[PDB]
């Protein structure tokens, strides 16, 4: 597998989203905000932003 996950997933590390040691933000089962600050779409992100120049 890719260089990143080795011990299942959970455990160790720390969640920089909630601040709970054991999991990561990417493994945060409790999302929030993460609202496109480009279009304002409080759901999708730039990686999922089909918008380029507003249009």
The residues binding Zn ion (CB under 5 A) are 15, 17-18, 28, 36, 38-39, 41, 49, 51
- Our CB check for Zn ion shows the closer of 13 and 28 to be 28
SS (H, E, C) the chain: CCCCCCCCCCCCCECCCCCCECCCHHHCCCCCCCCCCCCCCCCCCHHHCCCCCCC
In the complex, least distance from residue 43 CB atom to Zn ion, rounded to whole angstroms? 9
Nearer to Zn ion, 10 or 49 (CB): 49
Least separation in angstroms between CB 2 and Zn ion: 22
């Amino acid at each position: 597998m890719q260089k990143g996950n080795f011990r299942n997933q959970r455990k160790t590390v720390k969640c920089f989203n909630c601040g709970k040691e054991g999991h990561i933000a990417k493994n945060c089962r409790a999302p929030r905000k993460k609202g496109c600050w480009k279009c304002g779409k409080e759901g999708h992100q730039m990686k999922d932003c089909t918008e380029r120049q507003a249009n």
